[PDB]
Design a protein around this ligand. Structure first.
Ligand SMILES: [Ca+2]
Ligand SMILES: [Ca+2]
Length: 488
């Protein structure tokens, strides 16, 4: 069970519509699988990703699905269980692992369990949720609203995010059993793992360690079915994220490093990235140990303003940002649309706009909401016209990564590549690669000690030939370009 690979995050509703109702669905993903990975490592006609993560696919009243009403039923909007099985089979045929979002931290207020527990204090499901006693304080800020305690005819219940999302009571052994059963069910349907929210607010501050006890039990029990891949979201500093690598998770999303990559690509100076990367990998190596964690680097996801927007809609800077994280250790995660330069900021609905397949309209393109910001802005059709497009840039980076696995499992050492360059070595006992990323709109020069060096990768379409003088090999890197050298 190979856990290393580049992942692609898909919002089913916005990917591909196979039956003409404007809503993206599972059969649609099947129809477009070759775009992600055609199963042939010899071609670069596909992105080359080896895993896909589907945002919530269970029954739910919302367009996003994070508030589940039935964990054993596929949202009709996305298709059927049969479609899901055909997708898992088609993906495996191509070497693509499939993981799905598992919203088990809370349920929808419309979930039967809650409806029953909320309409009878003596209900059999009463203890599936958390019911108040003292203080209905309410801590506030963030982006949503406020209050963690809410009214419900038979008492007030706990709901960290929103009254529509009551939190499940993990202090109840039955809740833990039920959720594990749900996970096992989907694994038996063919899934390879899950994407999970690691923070569980039902545990009072005094029971923080119960979080790790829970995830360890969860992983141990579900792997009784088969080996799995688990990636968790823990939106906090690296010191807080680190232990999760030890108690059940293979990977965790590197939010802090994402912020640094974005800031550095925007500014054109490597300081921020250099300092943050050294700190974070240092924390992970100290608390977990190199080789005992699979980081999940990324730029932006389904809850954040798209990378292009964060870079002032500068496609060149977005290109550099892509080269940087796609050459980092671990399993990189690509947010759908990122590879063709989609834009979107503000409302989560905008960030989750329909994926653009065509310049204009065409069969399969979703339209459940207006494509206000991307219609006519970018598309796969347009990106396919030139071998040096952003889409082809992503294809080249991912395939290069797959052809040189040291990028997944090797160590990393930040080095000084100059005032406007992010540089680092990716290495193991057999490969010693030097990676250089030009962050600005002008050529930059880098020098290495005279010796046996080989140019392995050039992200641009220009001829890059080094010159040797006074025992130093000098390379002039064109604007926003990345190169990889091998030292022997
Ligand atoms: Ca459809
Ligand atoms: Ca291929």
């Amino acid at each position: 069970f190979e856990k290393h690979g580049t992942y692609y995050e898909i919002f089913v509703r916005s990917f591909y519509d196979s039956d003409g109702d404007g809503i993206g669905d599972l059969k649609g993903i099947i129809e477009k699988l070759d775009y992600l990975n055609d199963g042939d490592p010899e071609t670069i006609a596909d992105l080359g990703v080896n895993g896909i993560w589907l945002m919530p696919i269970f029954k739910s009243p919302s367009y996003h699905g994070y508030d589940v009403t039935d964990y054993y039923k596929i949202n009709p909007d996305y298709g059927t269980l049969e479609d899901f099985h055909k997708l898992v089979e088609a993906a495996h045929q191509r070497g693509i692992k499939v993981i799905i979002d598992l919203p088990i931290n809370h349920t929808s207020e419309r979930h039967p369990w809650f409806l029953k527990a909320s309409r009878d204090k003596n209900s059999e499901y009463r203890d599936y949720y958390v019911w108040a006693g003292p203080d209905t304080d309410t801590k506030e800020t963030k982006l949503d609203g406020g209050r963690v305690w809410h009214y419900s005819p038979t008492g007030m219940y706990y709901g960290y995010f929103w009254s529509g999302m009551p939190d499940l009571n993990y202090n109840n052994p039955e809740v833990q059993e039920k959720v594990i059963g749900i996970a096992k069910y989907w694994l038996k349907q063919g899934v390879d793992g899950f994407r999970l929210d690691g923070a569980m607010h039902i545990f009072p501050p005094a029971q923080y360690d119960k979080n790790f006890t829970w995830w360890e039990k969860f992983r141990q029990e579900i792997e009784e079915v088969k080996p799995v891949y688990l990636v968790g979201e823990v939106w906090d500093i690296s010191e807080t994220v680190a232990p999760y690598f030890k108690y059940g998770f293979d990977s965790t999303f590197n939010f802090k490093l994402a912020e640094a990559v974005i800031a550095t690509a925007k500014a054109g100076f490597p300081f921020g990235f250099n300092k943050k990367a050294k700190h974070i990998y240092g924390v992970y190596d100290r608390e977990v140990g190199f080789g005992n964690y699979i980081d999940a680097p990324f730029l932006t996801n389904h809850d954040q303003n798209r990378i292009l927007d964060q870079l002032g809609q500068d496609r060149n800077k977005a290109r550099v940002a892509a080269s940087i994280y796609l050459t980092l250790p671990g399993n990189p995660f690509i947010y759908y649309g990122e590879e063709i330069g989609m834009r979107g900021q503000g409302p989560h609905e905008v960030i989750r706009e329909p994926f653009q397949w065509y310049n204009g309209s065409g069969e399969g393109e979703t339209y459940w909401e207006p494509a206000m910001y991307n219609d006519g802005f970018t598309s796969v059709e347009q990106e396919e016209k030139n071998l040096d497009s952003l889409l082809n840039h992503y294809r080249r980076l991912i395939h290069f990564r797959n052809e040189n696995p040291v990028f997944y499992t090797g160590k990393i050492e930040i080095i000084n590549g100059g005032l406007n360059v992010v540089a680092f070595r990716r290495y193991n006992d057999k490969r010693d690669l030097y990676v250089y990323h030009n962050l600005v709109n002008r050529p930059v020069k880098i020098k290495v000690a005279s010796g046996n060096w080989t140019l392995l990768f050039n992200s641009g379409d220009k001829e890059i030939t080094p010159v040797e003088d006074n025992n130093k090999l000098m390379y002039t890197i064109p604007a926003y370009t990345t190169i990889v050298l091998e030292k022997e």
